[PDB]
RNA sequence: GAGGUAAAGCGAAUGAUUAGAAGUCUUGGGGUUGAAAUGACCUUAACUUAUUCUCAAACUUUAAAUAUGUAAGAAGUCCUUGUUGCUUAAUUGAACGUGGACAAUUGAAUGAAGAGCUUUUAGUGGGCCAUUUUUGGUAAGCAGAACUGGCGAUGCGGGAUGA
RNA sequence: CCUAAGGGGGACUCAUGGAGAACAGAAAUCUCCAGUAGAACAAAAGGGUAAAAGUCCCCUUGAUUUUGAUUUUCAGUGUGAA
RNA sequence: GGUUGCGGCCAUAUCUAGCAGAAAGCACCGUUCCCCGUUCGAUCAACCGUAGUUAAGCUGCUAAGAGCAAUACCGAGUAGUGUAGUGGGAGACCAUACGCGAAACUAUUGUGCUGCAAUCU
């Protein structure tokens, strides 16, 4: 008999982390969603109501609806060879705020503010992003590291 | 300083233990034999689990006490204290600073012996504890009591044999 | 032979609870159900008044939660009760009323809220809530969060509640925990909360015990003889307290005898202080070899 | 009249350990 | 009754014990696992050999067993039967499963027999004695070898005994007072701890 | 962001498991009894304490690699104040807005025979193979899953010959 | 399977061990201390739960009405359930 | 800086054993007519702040403490693993190549930080 039920497979997933069971710090419950923030969803195995589908647990969306208790997230979902929407209503204890928005909200700000200054100055600042590109010359100087010569090392057994 | 008012030794409670084996009538009359004593209404006790050996069944009213405090307790602890000559043991002490004795007849305590009601015998405890107590048992900031200030086997039995001139031996 | 219980394993797989609730002092279930704000109502907060009883004080503030820690809107003490008349029982039920209306009246002042939203001006014990004026702004919305204090019918935490009440501030609330509710005949006997309103429960023992126990009412009551009070005088404490209550609610906090920064010198001059690594290590050392005198 | 309210939460059992007569 | 060993020979399936899951298990044969002196200190037998798997592979208990009997035997026969204590490292914690005892419709297998999964590198046998027995005991082993399939090297051990110090760190953590016995093994100072405890169990500990 | 597989662990929980050692007032027994005292002794067995060998698909504090969600702007960021029967004690907020500011480095890489959209219909719905992960089985040119690539549907050069 | 084993509130803390109390003993009842859950939560197992979701008490019927949206299985049809 | 009330993160905050703690606060503490609750004013309820005490709670310090936290020319570039070959080996398995890379162990260091309001020698 093949069982296919709800919470299946979820015996690790939904768990509490170690040491870290039973009630629920209040700043979960303090927090503030809006319409269009992005949330992280990581399912709370105390809170059994408004708990997400464990297809939810570990996925990132944007909140769409905001209700006494719960709010409303919008992912998509693979199914076949397309993306359907998926709109899930999760108690707040289920989610999160998404730390993406605030590295790349501030991105912005640091281009707003140097490029303004460099319009102060007169001059000219490059904001686009780069990779990391192979390192220039350079020069060793061997006082006090004269280089210490290595060798391959002989077979020991060591039981 | 060891010798502080509020280090007091002093009776926190007397607990009045009868365990008849059985059910009913009888169960009845140990409940009144203690409401005599005491004055107060007695609390009947439930088998916690069923022993066909013992006679008892789960939930089966079998034994009955009641709980005293204050002047009333040093009382009729005297009055239990008499039917011992007042001598304890050294084992009738426990570890926590609490004591007990257990008489056979209800009616050397000094209470009027009626034919209807029978004899029953009696078993005593004491709860020792010094000012602050509270401390463990109030509802909010609930916290333990630091070792000097606990009642411990010895300080306890001085304190009895002062306190009753009496003498504890340790057969 | 039993079992060690305090292993090392055991330490080590030992949760913590939340640190105010190993203090025993939050009650995090109530808490969190006081707090708690419709996700809707973005960051519009809900107000607490917190109300707390020590041996000798009475505590209420209006506090509002916030991810930092909580922020005290007012606060009203007991011990502010002197300068609005009365010195002695600040721990009556009649002291908690007053101590509910004078934060109600502060933090109505501090709003704004004065000439609209008066309150209950002539008290007569009757339960009654503050209903919102029409064409104009809600009255005040706090919510009454008592603790771990039990909840009983004659509980002091009860006075401030409707001395908050009748001081203005909307705090919704039943009748049937005050002072004067027949549980037999479901009805308030608002006679009886008018009396434990001002201090008649502690008068009518005045006058019975000194006509019983003379001496007892001399060493339960001194402070009232002192000041030539008897309890034919005592409504009028409460009364002229209230007035006055109304009248200039405004904190006044304590001229101080120090600054902060003496008070820190001072208490500064206390407390043990942390041992250097290398002092501990000579401690040590001295402890390692003063065990010699037992190789026997 | 007045009677102890049970406390242990194995209210449903039927015997109980530490029985076992060979102690 | 009992197929050859080449039907279980490899780490086919997953780890196979005794649970709540399966109970009806024989016993394993190999029961002993400490033969010769086994109460002899650690300075009595300061000489360690090991056999060593050079095979990721199975060895039944029978065959541990086995082998385990011959290495006694002979080792009691040449040096006496207090010249040594013999340890088996490995224990057979892996049940074998047998099908027919139609086809291959239900084919999930009975318990039939345990065995033990070694890795490489792995040691199955350790034998303590003293040094002026060291033939006996390598060729002791050198038996023993020959009840196992697959590969195994007879290792002379660096260390002192079943402990985990060269046989140079021993002689420096005892003659330093680091180092007191506790019947057959050893207990090794700490400088962590109750001071005085430790202390108190190292009397003989020339502090720096 | 999520995870609980490999590995690792067991003087960490659970469960399993080899060996001694030191101790304790229900030591569990035998033995030397002294006349009986349960009060010693020799012993084996229990427990307790600090150690020791070996383990887990349906154990676990920890915990990869590979694989996996979101974001990286003009539909963006900020300022001011309009609408409402929703919300706030409120002149507080919510959503949607008017007006104003930030100009091509408009905010990573690489590519893009361009992007988006619609209708209609065929055949098919027995599969098999190779590497690796993997289950049952002693195993099978056996049976069953995971990812990819193939054969089927494909000739050509090589493997003599061979999906 | 359950008028509570549903709903709300309140009070209490469970398994177990040690030390103690007439008959009473390994198991009857009482007391203190310890007690991170080693218990209990209808029924399989997993997850979850400690001033509670467990034990006890009080009051109740939200196990009610109208229909929409959504999640799982999914063709993103139905049914069940949420 | 201490202290109280309400807190955030929830052991660097817990546990065990000692010792110390000015001022204020907190606390233990005294009493039972009244509201209230108990077998028991022990808990809960109310009154007094009067008769007493820092003994306890609490706070701080001590401990080659247990536990917890952090760091690393610690272990270890080890185990494992993505990718490759008409590599080795009968096989089991192993080496190499381009990448990623633990856990235990060891050593060292640390033992709450802090928001709002009030108050104090
Ligand atoms: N191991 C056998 C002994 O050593 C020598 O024998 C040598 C060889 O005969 C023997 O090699 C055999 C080989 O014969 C046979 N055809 C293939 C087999 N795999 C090899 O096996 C060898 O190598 C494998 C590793 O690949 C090891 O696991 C195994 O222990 C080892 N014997 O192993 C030795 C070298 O590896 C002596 N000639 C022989 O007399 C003696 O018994
Ligand atoms: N960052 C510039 C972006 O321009 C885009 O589009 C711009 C135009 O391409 C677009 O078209 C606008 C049209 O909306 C508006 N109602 C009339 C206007 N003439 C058009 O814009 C264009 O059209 C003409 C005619 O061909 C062109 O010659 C000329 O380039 C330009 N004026 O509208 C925008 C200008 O109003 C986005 N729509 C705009 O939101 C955004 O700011
Ligand atoms: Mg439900
Ligand atoms: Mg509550
Ligand atoms: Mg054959
Ligand atoms: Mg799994
Ligand atoms: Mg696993
Ligand atoms: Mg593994
Ligand atoms: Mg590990
Ligand atoms: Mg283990
Ligand atoms: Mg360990
Ligand atoms: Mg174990
Ligand atoms: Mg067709
Ligand atoms: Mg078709
Ligand atoms: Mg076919
Ligand atoms: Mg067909
Ligand atoms: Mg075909
Ligand atoms: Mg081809
Ligand atoms: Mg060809
Ligand atoms: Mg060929
Ligand atoms: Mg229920
Ligand atoms: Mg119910
Ligand atoms: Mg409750
Ligand atoms: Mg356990
Ligand atoms: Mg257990
Ligand atoms: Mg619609
Ligand atoms: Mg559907
Ligand atoms: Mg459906
Ligand atoms: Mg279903
Ligand atoms: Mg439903």
């Given at each position: ?46 809170i059994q ?20 208790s ?30 993406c ?5 501030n ?17 000219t ?35 | ?50 022993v ?27 009055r ?15 570890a ?21 009601i ?16 509270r ?22 039995i001085?304190?009895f ?11 | ?27 995090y ?13 973005y ?12 041996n ?38 009649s002291?908690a ?24 001006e ?16 809600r ?58 309103i ?66 820190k ?9 942390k041992?250097?690594?290398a ?11 003063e ?6 | ?11 449903p ?5 530490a ?5 | ?34 033969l010769?002196r ?34 006694n ?6 040096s ?36 033990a ?40 051990s ?51």
């Amino acid at each position: 008999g093949k069982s296919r039920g709800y919470r299946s497979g979820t015996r690790y997933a939904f768990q509490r982390d170690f040491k870290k069971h039973g009630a629920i710090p209040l700043s979960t419950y303090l927090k503030v969603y809006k319409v269009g923030d992005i949330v992280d969803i990581k399912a709370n195995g105390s809170i059994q109501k408004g708990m997400p589908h464990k297809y939810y647990h570990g996925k990132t969306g944007i909140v769409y609806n905001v209700t006494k208790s719960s709010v409303g997230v919008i992912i998509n979902k693979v199914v076949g060879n397309r993306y359907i929407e998926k709109r899930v209503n999760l108690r707040v204890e289920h989610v999160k705020h998404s730390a993406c928005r605030q590295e790349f909200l501030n991105r912005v700000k640091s281009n707003a503010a140097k490029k303004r200054e460099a319009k102060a100055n007169g001059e000219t600042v490059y904001l686009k992003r780069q990779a990391a590109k192979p390192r220039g010359s350079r020069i060793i100087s061997t006082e006090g590291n004269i280089p210490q010569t290595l060798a391959p090392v002989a077979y020991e057994t060591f039981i | 300083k060891s010798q502080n008012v509020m280090r007091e030794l002093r009776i926190e409670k007397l607990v009045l233990n009868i365990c008849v084996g059985e059910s009913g009538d009888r169960l009845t009359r140990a409940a009144k034999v203690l409401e005599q004593l005491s004055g107060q209404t007695p609390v009947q006790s439930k088998a916690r689990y069923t022993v066909r050996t013992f006679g008892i069944r789960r939930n089966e009213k079998i034994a009955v006490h009641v709980t005293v405090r204050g002047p009333k307790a040093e009382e009729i602890l005297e009055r239990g204290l008499k039917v011992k000559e007042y001598q304890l043991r050294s084992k009738n002490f426990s570890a926590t600073g609490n004591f007990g004795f257990g008489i056979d007849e209800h009616i050397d305590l000094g209470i009027k012996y009626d034919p209807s009601i029978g004899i029953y015998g009696m078993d005593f405890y004491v709860v020792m504890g010094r000012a602050g107590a509270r401390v463990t048992r109030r509802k909010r900031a609930r916290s333990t009591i630091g070792n000097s200030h606990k009642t411990n086997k010895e300080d306890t039995i001085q304190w009895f044999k002062t306190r009753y001139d009496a003498e504890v031996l340790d057969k | 032979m039993q079992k060690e219980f305090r292993t090392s394993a055991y330490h080590s797989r030992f949760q913590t609870p939340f640190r105010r609730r190993q203090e025993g002092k939050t009650d995090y279930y109530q808490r969190k159900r006081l707090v708690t704000q419709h996700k809707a109502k973005y960051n519009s907060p809900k107000y607490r008044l917190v109300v707390r009883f020590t041996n000798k004080d009475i505590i209420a503030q209006i506090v509002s939660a916030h991810i930092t820690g909580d922020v005290v809107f007012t606060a009203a003490y007991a011990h502010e009760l002197p300068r609005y008349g009365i010195k002695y029982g600040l721990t009556n039920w009649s002291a908690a009323y007053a101590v509910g209306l004078l934060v109600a009246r502060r933090a109505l002042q501090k709003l704004g809220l004065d000439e609209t939203y008066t309150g209950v001006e002539e008290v007569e014990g009757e339960f009654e809530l503050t209903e919102a004026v029409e064409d104009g702004p809600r009255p005040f919305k706090v919510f009454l969060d008592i603790g771990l204090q039990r909840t009983t019918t004659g509980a002091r935490v009860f006075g401030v509640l409707k001395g908050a009440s009748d001081g203005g501030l909307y705090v919704p609330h039943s009748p049937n925990r005050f002072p004067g509710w027949d549980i037999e005949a479901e009805e308030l006997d608002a006679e009886l909360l008018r009396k434990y309103i001002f201090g008649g429960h502690v008068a009518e023992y005045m006058e019975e015990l000194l006509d019983d126990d003379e001496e007892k009412y001399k060493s339960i009551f001194k402070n009232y003889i002192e000041e030539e009070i008897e309890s034919e005088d005592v409504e009028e404490i409460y009364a002229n307290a209230h007035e006055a209550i109304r009248a200039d609610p405004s904190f006044k906090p304590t001229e101080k005898k120090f600054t902060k920064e003496q008070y820190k010198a001072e208490s500064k001059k206390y407390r043990q202080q942390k041992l250097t690594r290398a002092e501990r290590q000579a401690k040590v050392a001295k402890k390692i070899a003063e065990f010699k005198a037992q190789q026997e | 009249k007045n009677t102890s309210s049970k406390k242990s939460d194995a209210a449903p059992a039927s015997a109980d350990p530490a029985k076992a007569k060979k102690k | 009754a009992r197929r050859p060993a080449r039907c279980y020979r490899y780490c086919k399936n997953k780890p196979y014990p005794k649970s709540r899951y399966n109970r009806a298990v024989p016993d394993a044969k190999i029961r002993i696992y400490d033969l010769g002196r086994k109460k002899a200190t650690v300075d009595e037998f300061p000489l360690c050999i090991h056999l060593v798997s050079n095979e990721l592979e199975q060895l039944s208990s029978e065959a541990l067993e086995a082998a385990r009997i011959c290495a006694n035997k002979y080792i009691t026969k040449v040096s006496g039967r207090d010249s040594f204590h013999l340890r088996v490292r490995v224990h057979p914690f892996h049940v074998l499963r047998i099908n027919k005892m139609q086809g291959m419709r239900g084919a999930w297998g009975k318990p039939h027999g345990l065995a033990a999964r070694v890795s490489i590198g792995q040691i199955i046998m350790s034998a303590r004695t003293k040094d002026s027995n060291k033939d006996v005991v390598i060729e002791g082993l050198r038996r023993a070898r020959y009840k196992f399939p697959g590969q195994q090297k007879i290792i002379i051990s660096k260390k002192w005994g079943f402990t985990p110090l060269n046989r140079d760190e021993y002689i420096a953590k005892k003659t330093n007072g680091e180092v007191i016995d506790d019947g057959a093994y050893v207990k090794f100072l700490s400088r962590k701890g109750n001071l005085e405890a430790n202390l108190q169990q190292f009397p003989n500990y020339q502090y720096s």
